Amino acid sequence: PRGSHMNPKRIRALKSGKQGDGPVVYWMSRDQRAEDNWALLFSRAIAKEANVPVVVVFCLTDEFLEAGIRQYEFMLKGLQELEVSLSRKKIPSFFLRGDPGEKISRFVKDYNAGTLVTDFSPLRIKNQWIEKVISGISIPFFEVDAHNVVPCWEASQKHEYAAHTFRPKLYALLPEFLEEFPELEPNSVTPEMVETLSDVLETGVKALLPERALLKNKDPLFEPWHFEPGEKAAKKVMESFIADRLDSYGALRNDPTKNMLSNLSPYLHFGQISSQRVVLEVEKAESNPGSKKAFLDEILIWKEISDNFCYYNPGYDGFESFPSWAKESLNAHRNDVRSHIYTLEEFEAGKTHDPLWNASQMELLSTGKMHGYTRMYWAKKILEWSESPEKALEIAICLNDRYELDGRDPNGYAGIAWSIGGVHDRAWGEREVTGKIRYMSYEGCKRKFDVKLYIEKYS
């Protein structure tokens, strides 16, 4: 590759081969943005060294049927804006429909690709697709970490027990890896599905319409105006956070009645904005130092340790990935009698006895983003009022992935594992049902914020 502000350690070879005659193809998956994208940039750099065009390919899977119209519209509306952004950079974008394992392979043959580059996800499905693609192509294949500031395989070579073991290794490498971004260079070389993306959205929304979330009077639950989608909207949210919410963040990040969070998770999850970008802007901002340490810890340690978790523990969304002490503790309490037991359907409709739990579910149903403090309480009550730890993990993941705009994310699996299974936490006083897993109480919540205001806001 060979260039300024392009550390070679951000890229690694999935497969070696003979470089092809054709264009460099960036298989975009996790990081759906033109700016501050190390994978797009590396793909562009390979293109310059080889005197070839860079092109972006994206696969429209049947995974959308798993979630709702809320996330399909957010992603697809974002992708319509992205096609236009990429087009201004003279970068063509190709949208394939179907299975990435077969469709990426066929595209490389059909479009005569020279080099394949993709971004990094520690999720099982991306790795499965990469394995399939490797078996179907002759060309060199590179992986670039565009999501984490320090590349996941570089920060640590093993599972990290706690944030404290991770913090020294990540912080030692931050001076090297926390750096500004080069501008994306438009295409120099002339670049050689048929449906419109609007058509795809229309066909997909008709397929999802029967199962769309409705209130009892037939009126839809989802309010689409809370987070407008796309790269342009993402940046406006980051700007208002620094301007309006970062000063109060150290004091108020755990009060759900206050709108004092970044609101960046839906854009971060789809890769509509870079975490490295957000950290650069926050570092430079003159703000309360307590707020800066609190927020940088969240977007650097906690977000990037969630990738460490999924990358070194392939069963990240199961019981086995919990630490020994936690699995041992939860196992001993499997027979304990739950105070309540709710089904997925009762949980989903917000019909528990706990008005605070119900309000947290209604914030999830109506806005698509539950406040970060109540997500801890929400997941820990699923554990407390479920038949088993496995049923709890299953119900929390089902509701999180169906209804959160930021769901189906390593942060989600690491966050749920912390809450239910103690991952990256320590043991606490033993209790019935939840054992030594950290406990959170309705009364504890009453002490810390105006619980009644939150409940009133969400019926």
Add this chain to the structure above:
DNA sequence: ATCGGCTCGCGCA
């Protein structure tokens, strides 16, 4: 061959 230090609830102001 031994210890300091890690993202709650509670009792106290």
Add this chain to the structure above:
DNA sequence: TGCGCGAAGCCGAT
């Protein structure tokens, strides 16, 4: 509200 301890398993600095 803000503070110090309790209950608690283990990592790694020494």
